[PDB]
Amino acid sequence: VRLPALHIAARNDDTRTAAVLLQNDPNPDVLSKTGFTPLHIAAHYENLNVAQLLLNRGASVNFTPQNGITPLHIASRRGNVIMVRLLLDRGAQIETKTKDELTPLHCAARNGHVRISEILLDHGAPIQAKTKNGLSPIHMAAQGDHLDCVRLLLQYDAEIDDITLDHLTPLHVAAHCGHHRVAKVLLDKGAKPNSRALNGFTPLHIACKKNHVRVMELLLKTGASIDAVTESGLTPLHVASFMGHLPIVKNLLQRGASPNVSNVKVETPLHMAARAGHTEVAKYLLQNKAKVNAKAKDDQTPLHCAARIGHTNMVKLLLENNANPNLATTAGHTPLHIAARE
């Protein structure tokens, strides 16, 4: 359950113990239980002396365990610039992929190591290489809020609108994670603000979903469509009203988003605020424009949706403003019949 002695000497950078061990056992590529050579441990802790000692005794600079993590991968992930240089000088392969198809550039960009990424690019690393999910290094840089890494990769002609398997652009990832600085750099460099995901989600839709207000303002300022709909017809106010993010719902209504838009299910933003139960969104949706007695599929008012879930503050806001209890669905169910049912 203890590491092999050459792995322990690698972690401690003990070149004297390593020299004695290699004199006794001439194999520098001894495997641990995980399958990692001592060169992998030296690359992780940037022990350059024991790394050169191991490489001078025949250690495989391109050793590939079962998971595909070469020492160059570890050095790039850990930010070991000097170890990356040493491994590249001794013949490390620049395009080798892990089990999940990550290149060393993927590991560098995911952790935002600008210097290492530039060294790998200058050595010919593929900037458009993809993982199993279709993530390019710029996707990993945008996911980690690594502004200078998005900035360097864009300088090296990375595709600003590359898509994953879920049709996610780096702008989509930035909107998802709330990184408004990455989104600002991408949009100021020509990224399309109305890119569609697999379900037709724009970056504005995702920003309105996750209550990322700064990304929302940046997108709307860089010409994102405020009335863009999904495959299901969801506007950004449908997403904001359903998720309950009052900052987004007020910002979208101050800018002139129609609070009376519909979806495949003829649902309006006040219907989704009644079904979820956000009485401060609904309150704003009415204060502005929104039809308290508006109807959807089956002839359902927001009073019906609020009475189904049993929210009384919502019922009491809808009923106080203009809601009429006597309105009934196609099956004849008033809000008093749903409330009696539940």
Binding site: Y45, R78, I82, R115
Partner: protein, 163 residues
């Protein structure tokens, strides 16, 4: 791991001695003295002891060599000024390796009387941060006047009043 000395190489007229210091040693100006049984103390010379971002057992240890080169060895810095949407990088000469900067820093640190705590980077950072803020309040004047040549002339003026 403590204070030690071993003769690594020797000839008939000389000893080559490797001397170690503890990773938690008190920093500052040191004297090395030799005691030869049945004789008085002989001063071998002076040396200055510093923190070691390169030793794994030091409190200021840094994992990366590149981070060590950037956060301790580089005198060419960049102070970012301007606004959030318009960042202007100003070139700055930190000049930590200027001849008198180490002496000035140790003289300023000597205003703190808890010399036993000078082994602790936290205590040293807090004392110098407080002393430097006091000096900034004392020496910075209310409003070429904006021409700057780095940190070293400012430190010299703050400590000596000249410049």
């Amino acid at each position: 791991k403590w204070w030690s000395a071993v003769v690594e190489e020797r000839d008939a007229q000389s000893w080559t001695i490797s001397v170690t210091t503890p990773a938690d040693a008190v920093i500052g100006h040191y004297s090395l003295l030799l005691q030869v049984s049945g004789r008085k103390q002989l001063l071998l010379g002076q040396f200055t002891l510093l923190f070691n971002p390169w030793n794994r057992e030091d409190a200021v240890f840094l994992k990366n060599e590149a981070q060590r080169m950037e956060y301790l060895l580089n005198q060419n810095g960049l102070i970012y000024l301007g606004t959030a949407d318009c960042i202007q990088a100003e070139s700055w000469d930190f000049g930590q390796f200027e001849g008198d900067v180490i002496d000035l820093s140790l003289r300023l640190l000597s205003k703190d009387k808890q010399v036993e705590k000078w082994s602790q980077p936290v205590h040293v950072a807090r004392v110098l941060g407080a002393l430097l803020h006091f000096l900034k309040e004392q020496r910075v004047l209310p409003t070429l006047l904006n021409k700057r040549r780095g940190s070293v002339p400012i430190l010299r003026q703050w400590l000596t009043g000249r410049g």
